[PDB]
Every structure is written in C-alpha cells, then in structure tokens.
Ligand binder design. Sequence first.
Ligand code: CA
Ligand code: CA
Length: 68
Amino acid sequence: NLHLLRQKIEEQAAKYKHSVPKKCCYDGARVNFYETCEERVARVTIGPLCIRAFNECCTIANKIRKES
Ligand SMILES: [Ca+2]
Ligand SMILES: [Ca+2]
C-alpha cells in the first residue's frame, strides 16, 4: 500500500527537524531487498540521529509492506 506508506513515512520524517536526518529516514524507508533493516543500517555512519531515523523509518515501511 504505497499511499499509506507515503503518509506514515511523512509523519515520522516530520519529527526530524533537519534535512539530513530527514533523508536518513526517507532512505531507510526504501529498504526492501534481501537485507533487513538491522543489516542495512549497520553501514550508516553519519551519526546517532541519522541511524535512529533510518531505523525507525525502515521499520515503519517494513511493517506496512508486511500488512499489505
Ligand atoms: Ca531537500
Ligand atoms: Ca542512501
């Protein structure tokens, strides 16, 4: 469900008040191949906030894809 996915990611991204961790979130939400969120976030080295945003948005996206 791409419509819901978009809205829920926007809702979470809005919590990050700078474009860099915003993009960390958006990038996180794109993870949908064979690597899990945990595996994929291990290579994110920008800093703790970027890692949290990537994690949260990857997790949100994954849940939504699962429920569709
Ligand atoms: Ca921008
Ligand atoms: Ca990226």
